[PDB]
Each structure stands twice: as C-alpha cells, then as structure tokens.
C-alpha cells in the first residue's frame, strides 16, 4: 500500500481545482444578475443564493474537506464544525432549489396573482430564514449529536493528539444514523420528491393550459361549420357557444379590441337569429373568420409561445435539480451502506474521495446549464467575458 500523500496530492489538486472553477463560474451568475435588469426578479434571488452556497463549497468547504482528509489532531467540536459546514451549504442549496419551483408553480398557476404575491421583500425575508434554517440543521451535531463522548481512544493516541483532541475523521465525529435519517431521509431525500411533485404539477398545469387554448380555437373553428350548414335555434345554439368560448378566451387595446368585436359580431348574429332571420345571421356569422386572423389567433399563438417559455424555462431548472441529486446522491447511498449493512465491505479510500469530488463538482455545473438553456444568462456571459476578459 503506497505513500498516503502521493494519492493525497490528487486528490488536493483536484479539490483546489474544483474550487476554482466554483468561484469562478458562480461570481459570474451573481456578476450578470447585478448587470442586467431583465434577470432581476424573484426567480433569480433564489439562484443568487444558491450562487453564494457554491462560492462557499469553494472558500470554505473545499478547504475543509482537504484539511478533515489529514486526519489532523483537533478539539472534537472544532472537528463537527469542519465536518458539517458543508451540510449547511447544501440544506441552503436544498431551500433555493425548493423556493424556485414553487415559484415557477405560481407563475403558471395564477399568473395574475404572481406580482401581488411574489415580491423582492418577501424574497429576501425567506432566504434569510433558510440561511438561518440552514446553518441550525447542517450545525445540529455541534447541539450534541455526536460521537464526541466516545473518542477512538488508538487513533488519539497513535498520532499524539492532547487531551480533549480526536484524530479529526467525518466518520468518527459525525453520527451514521443522522447522516441517513437526519440529513438524507428528512433534509435531503423529502425535499427532492416534494420538488419532483412540484415539477410534475408545473408541467401538467401547462399541458392543461395548452389543450384549453387549443379546445378554444378547435371551437370557434368548429361551430363556424355548424353555422354554415343550412333552422335558426340550431345557429343560436352554435353562436351560444362561441359567445361562452369567446369570453372564456379573455378569462391592452390590440388585445381587448379583437375580442370587443368577436363578441359584437356574435349579438349581432344572436339579434337575427331570435328575430328567426337565419340567412342574415349566417352572413353575420362569416364576419368573424376575418376577426379570427387579424386578432384571435395573434392572442393565441402568443398564449402557446409563453407557456411553451415557461416549460422550457421549467425543464432547465428541473435538470439543475436533477444534477444535485446525481452528484450527492453517492455520498449517501455510502453512508446508507456503512449504517444499514455494517457486515457489508466499506468503499475503498479512493472511492469515498471520488463520491466527495463528484459532490463539490455540483459547485460548478449550474453556470454551464444557465450558459446553454437561458438566453439573457448566456448574452450577459459574453458582454462580461467580451468587456473584462477580453479587455
Ligand atoms: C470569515 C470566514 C472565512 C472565517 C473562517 C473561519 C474558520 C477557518 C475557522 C472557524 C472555526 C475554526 C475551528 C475552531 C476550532 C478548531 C479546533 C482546533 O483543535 C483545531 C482548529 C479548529 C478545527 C478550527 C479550524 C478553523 C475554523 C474552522
Ligand atoms: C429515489 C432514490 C433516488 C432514493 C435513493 C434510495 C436509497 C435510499 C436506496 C438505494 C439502494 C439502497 C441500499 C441497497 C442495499 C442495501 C443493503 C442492505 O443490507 C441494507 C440496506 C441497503 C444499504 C439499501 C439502503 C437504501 C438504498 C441506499
Ligand atoms: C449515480 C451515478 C452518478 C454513479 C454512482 C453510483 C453509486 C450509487 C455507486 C458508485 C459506487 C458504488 C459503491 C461501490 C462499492 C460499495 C461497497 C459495497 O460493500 C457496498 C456498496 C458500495 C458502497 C457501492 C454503493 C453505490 C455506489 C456508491
Ligand atoms: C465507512 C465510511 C467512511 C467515511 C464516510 C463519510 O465520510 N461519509 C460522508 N458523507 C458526507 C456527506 C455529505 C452529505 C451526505 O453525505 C461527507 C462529507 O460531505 C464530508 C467530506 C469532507 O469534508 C467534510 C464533509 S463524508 C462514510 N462511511
Ligand atoms: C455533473 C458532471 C460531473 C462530471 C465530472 C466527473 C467527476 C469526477 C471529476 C474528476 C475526476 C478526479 C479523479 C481523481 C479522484 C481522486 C482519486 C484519488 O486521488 O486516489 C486516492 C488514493 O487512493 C488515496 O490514497
Ligand atoms: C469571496 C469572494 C466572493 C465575491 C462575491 C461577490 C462578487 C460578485 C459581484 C457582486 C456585485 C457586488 C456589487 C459590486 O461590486 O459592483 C460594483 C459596480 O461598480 C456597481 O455598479
Ligand atoms: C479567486 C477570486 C475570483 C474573483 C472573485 C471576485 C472578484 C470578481 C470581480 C468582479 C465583480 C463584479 C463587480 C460588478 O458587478 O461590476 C460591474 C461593473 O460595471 C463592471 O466593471
Ligand atoms: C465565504 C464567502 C461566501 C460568498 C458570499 C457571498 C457571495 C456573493 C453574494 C452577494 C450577492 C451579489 C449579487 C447581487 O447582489 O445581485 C443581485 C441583485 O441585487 C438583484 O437585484
Ligand atoms: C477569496 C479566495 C480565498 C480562498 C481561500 C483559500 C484557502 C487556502 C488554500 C488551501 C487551504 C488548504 C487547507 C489547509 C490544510 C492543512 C492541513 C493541516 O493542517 O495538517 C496538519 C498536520 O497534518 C498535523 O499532523
Ligand atoms: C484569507 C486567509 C487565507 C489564508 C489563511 C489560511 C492558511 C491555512 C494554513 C493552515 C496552516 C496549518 O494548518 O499548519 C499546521 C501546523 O503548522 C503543523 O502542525
Ligand atoms: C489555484 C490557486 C489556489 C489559491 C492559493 C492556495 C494555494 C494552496 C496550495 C496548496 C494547498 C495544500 C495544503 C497542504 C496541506 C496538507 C499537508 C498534509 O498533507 O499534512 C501531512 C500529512 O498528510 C498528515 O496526515
Ligand atoms: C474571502 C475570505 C477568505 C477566507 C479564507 C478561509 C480559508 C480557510 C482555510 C483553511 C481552513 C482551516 C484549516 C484548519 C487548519 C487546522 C490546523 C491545526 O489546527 O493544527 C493543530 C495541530 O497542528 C495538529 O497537529
Ligand atoms: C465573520 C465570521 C463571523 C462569525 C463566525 C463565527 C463562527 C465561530 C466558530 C464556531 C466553531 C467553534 O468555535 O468550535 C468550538 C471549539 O473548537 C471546541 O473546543
Ligand atoms: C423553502 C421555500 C418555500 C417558500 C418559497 C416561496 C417562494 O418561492 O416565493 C416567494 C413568495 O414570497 C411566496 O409568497
Ligand atoms: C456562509 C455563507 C453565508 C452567507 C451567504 C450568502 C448570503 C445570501 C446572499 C444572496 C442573497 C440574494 C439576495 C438578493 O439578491 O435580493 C435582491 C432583492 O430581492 C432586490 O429587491
Ligand atoms: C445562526 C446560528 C444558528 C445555529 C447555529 C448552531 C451552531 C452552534 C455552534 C457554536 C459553537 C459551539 O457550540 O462550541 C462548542 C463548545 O466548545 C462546546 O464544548
Ligand atoms: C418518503 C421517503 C423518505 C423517507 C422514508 C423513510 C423510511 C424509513 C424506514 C426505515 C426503517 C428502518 O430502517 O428501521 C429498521 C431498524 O434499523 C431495524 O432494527
Ligand atoms: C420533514 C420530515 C419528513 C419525514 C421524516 C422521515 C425520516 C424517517 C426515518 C426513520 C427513523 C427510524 O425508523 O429509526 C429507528 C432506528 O434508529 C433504526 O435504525
Ligand atoms: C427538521 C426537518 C426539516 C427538513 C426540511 C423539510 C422542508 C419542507 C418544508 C416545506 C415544504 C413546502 C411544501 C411544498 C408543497 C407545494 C406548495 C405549493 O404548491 O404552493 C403554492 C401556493 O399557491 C403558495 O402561495
Ligand atoms: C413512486 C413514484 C410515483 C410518482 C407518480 C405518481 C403520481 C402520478 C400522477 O398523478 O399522474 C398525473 C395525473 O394526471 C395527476 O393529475
Ligand atoms: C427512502 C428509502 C427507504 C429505504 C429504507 C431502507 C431500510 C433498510 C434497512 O432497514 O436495513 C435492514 C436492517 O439494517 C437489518 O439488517
Ligand atoms: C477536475 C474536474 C473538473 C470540474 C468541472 C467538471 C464538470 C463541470 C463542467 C460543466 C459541464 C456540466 C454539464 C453541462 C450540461 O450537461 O449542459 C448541456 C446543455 O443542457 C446543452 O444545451
Ligand atoms: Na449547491
């Protein structure tokens, strides 16, 4: 078995250089969202936040996880603190990525209501509480959740430590049964299902949204033929239900004045029709296929391409999701084996410093996935890399 530093020098090499790149890539997220008014909104307070959580996975818990690496003599608290500060990192991260899909819930949900309901304040009230939140639940070992009162009394002894001081291992400090039922079950593995549900309500809402516009217009389209089949209580019945699709369209001015006519060329056809004029209600009727192009499908295409934005918007924030669980889940799975199977094989060495890498490099993926899917993200990279790297 080889000299443990040559092995250690890999893995601190590509721990720093993890770090890099996290600082970096994240200091640009939050560079481009104080440029550029078209990303200031609620939406991307919750990615600065969770910006500033991968910033600290580069200043802090990089550092730390180097440091816990060495096996060094510490006070034992002085250890929980090294060990856990990066659970409050991702209980933050857990928080913002939860914050962001319920607000993309209400976008789609009662757009109207949104503003009123989602505003800057109420924003920064709640990622103050989750920071707050956050540093009390990845800290709760430091309130005596711990293995402090039983110290490996040989490793203390064969590397010298003093009184009071452990050989600072996560594994030896840290409790298993709140690793997996604390921190994984209830802090981690809750939270992704309740965003997995919310992503799922998001993407159906749409879909809901997207067949009642495509109903509507199916509607109009179809009594139109119904109309101009020739009775006149059979041209009152089809304009009865356009009335009621027209109005259920509306539910400024080049908007609210092609459905002012729709309506009125309706009445107007209603008027002949109980008057019992059906020719002239039939002819009254054809006014509309005109009203339809130059207005009522210029609303519709523009209803589609909004939504048709937000679940496009809704599966890029999703996949940021997704590659959180992908890169900690390994992590946990490990720590479920060690609790779980204590008669099972540990992971070897190389393969826990392999589980911790792939868990600091979610510090970098967010900015590539708002470089490729955001187009306002994607432009501000530039002018900033055009402007100050360039120049
Ligand atoms: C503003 C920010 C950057 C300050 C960062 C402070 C960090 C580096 C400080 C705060 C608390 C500190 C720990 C507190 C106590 C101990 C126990 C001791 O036996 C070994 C050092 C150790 C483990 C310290 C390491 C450094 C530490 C983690
Ligand atoms: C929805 C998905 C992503 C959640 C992840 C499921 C996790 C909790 C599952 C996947 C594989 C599972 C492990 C598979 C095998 C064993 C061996 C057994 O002797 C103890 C339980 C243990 C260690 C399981 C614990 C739970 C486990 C880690
Ligand atoms: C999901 C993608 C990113 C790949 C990672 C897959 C994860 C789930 C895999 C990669 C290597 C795996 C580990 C490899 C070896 C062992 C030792 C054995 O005694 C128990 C299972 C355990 C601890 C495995 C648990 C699951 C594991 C951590
Ligand atoms: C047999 C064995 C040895 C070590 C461990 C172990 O270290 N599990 C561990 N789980 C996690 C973890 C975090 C989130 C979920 O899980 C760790 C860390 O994030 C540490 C990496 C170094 O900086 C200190 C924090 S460390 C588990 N089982
Ligand atoms: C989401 C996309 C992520 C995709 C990116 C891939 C993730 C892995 C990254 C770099 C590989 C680093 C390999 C080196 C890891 C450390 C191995 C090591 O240092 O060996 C320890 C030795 O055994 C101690 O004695
Ligand atoms: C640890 C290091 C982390 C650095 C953290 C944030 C920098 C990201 C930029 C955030 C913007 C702050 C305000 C600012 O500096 O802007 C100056 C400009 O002149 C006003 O228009
Ligand atoms: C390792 C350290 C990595 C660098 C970290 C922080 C400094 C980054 C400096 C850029 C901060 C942006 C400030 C800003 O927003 O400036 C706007 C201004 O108008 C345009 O010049
Ligand atoms: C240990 C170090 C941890 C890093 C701490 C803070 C990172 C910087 C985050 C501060 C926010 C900068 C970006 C910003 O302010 O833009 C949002 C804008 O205000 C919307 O209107
Ligand atoms: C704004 C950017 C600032 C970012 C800040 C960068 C931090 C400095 C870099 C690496 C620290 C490496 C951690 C030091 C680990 C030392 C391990 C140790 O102390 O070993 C004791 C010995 O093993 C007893 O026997
Ligand atoms: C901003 C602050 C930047 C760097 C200060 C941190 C430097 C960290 C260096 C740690 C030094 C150390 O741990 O030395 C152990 C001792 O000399 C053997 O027992
Ligand atoms: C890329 C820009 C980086 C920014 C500037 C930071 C430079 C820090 C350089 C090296 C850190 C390595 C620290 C070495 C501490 C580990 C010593 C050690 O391994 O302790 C002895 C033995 O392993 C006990 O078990
Ligand atoms: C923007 C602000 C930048 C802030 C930058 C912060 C960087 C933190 C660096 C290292 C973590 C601390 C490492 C702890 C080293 C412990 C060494 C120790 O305690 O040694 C005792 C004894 O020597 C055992 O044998
Ligand atoms: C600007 C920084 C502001 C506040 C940092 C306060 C953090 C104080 C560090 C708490 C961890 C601690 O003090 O550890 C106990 C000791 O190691 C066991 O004997
Ligand atoms: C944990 C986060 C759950 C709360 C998030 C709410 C949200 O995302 O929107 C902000 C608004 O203040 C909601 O009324
Ligand atoms: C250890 C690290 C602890 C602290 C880290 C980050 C604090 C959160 C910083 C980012 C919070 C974003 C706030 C914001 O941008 O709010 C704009 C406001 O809504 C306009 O009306
Ligand atoms: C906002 C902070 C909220 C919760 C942080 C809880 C973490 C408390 C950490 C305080 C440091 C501490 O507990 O010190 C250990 C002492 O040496 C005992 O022996
Ligand atoms: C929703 C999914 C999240 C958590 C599920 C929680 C399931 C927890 C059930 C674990 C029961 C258990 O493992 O206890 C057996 C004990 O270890 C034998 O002595
Ligand atoms: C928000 C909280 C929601 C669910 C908590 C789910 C956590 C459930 C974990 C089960 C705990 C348990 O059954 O522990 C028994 C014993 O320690 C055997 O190992
Ligand atoms: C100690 C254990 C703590 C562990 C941490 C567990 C985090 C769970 C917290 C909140 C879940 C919020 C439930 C999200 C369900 C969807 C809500 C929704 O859809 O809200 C829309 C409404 O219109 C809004 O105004
Ligand atoms: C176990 C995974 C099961 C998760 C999926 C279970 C719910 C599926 C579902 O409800 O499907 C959508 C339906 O249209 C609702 O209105
Ligand atoms: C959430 C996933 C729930 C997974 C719950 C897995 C519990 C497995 C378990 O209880 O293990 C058997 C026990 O260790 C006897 O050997
Ligand atoms: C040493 C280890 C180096 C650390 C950096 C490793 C990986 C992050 C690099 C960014 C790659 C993240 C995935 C990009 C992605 O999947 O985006 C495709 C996009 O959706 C198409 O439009
Ligand atoms: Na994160």
Known sequence: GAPPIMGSSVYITVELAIAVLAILGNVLVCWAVWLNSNLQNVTNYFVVSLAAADIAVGVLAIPFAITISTGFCAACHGCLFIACFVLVLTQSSIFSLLAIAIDRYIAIRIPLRYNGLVTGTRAKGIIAICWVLSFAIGLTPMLGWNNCGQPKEGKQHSQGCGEGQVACLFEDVVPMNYMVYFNFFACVLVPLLLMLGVYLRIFLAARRQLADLEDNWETLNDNLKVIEKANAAQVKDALTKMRAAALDAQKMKDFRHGFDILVGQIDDALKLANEGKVKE??????????????????????????????????????????????????????????????????????????????????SVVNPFIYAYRIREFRQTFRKIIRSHVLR
């Open 281 to 362: 209600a039939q002819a009254a009727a054809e006014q509309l296929k005109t009203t339809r192009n130059a207005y009522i499908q210029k609303y519709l295409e523009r209803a589609r391409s909004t939504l048709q934005k937000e679940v496009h918007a809704a599966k890029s924030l999703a996949i940021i999701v997704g590659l959180f669980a992908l890169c900690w889940l390994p992590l946990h799975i490990i720590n479920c084996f060690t609790f779980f199977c204590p008669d099972c094989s540990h992971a070897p060495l190389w393969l826990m410093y392999l589980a911790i890498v792939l868990s600091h490099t979610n």
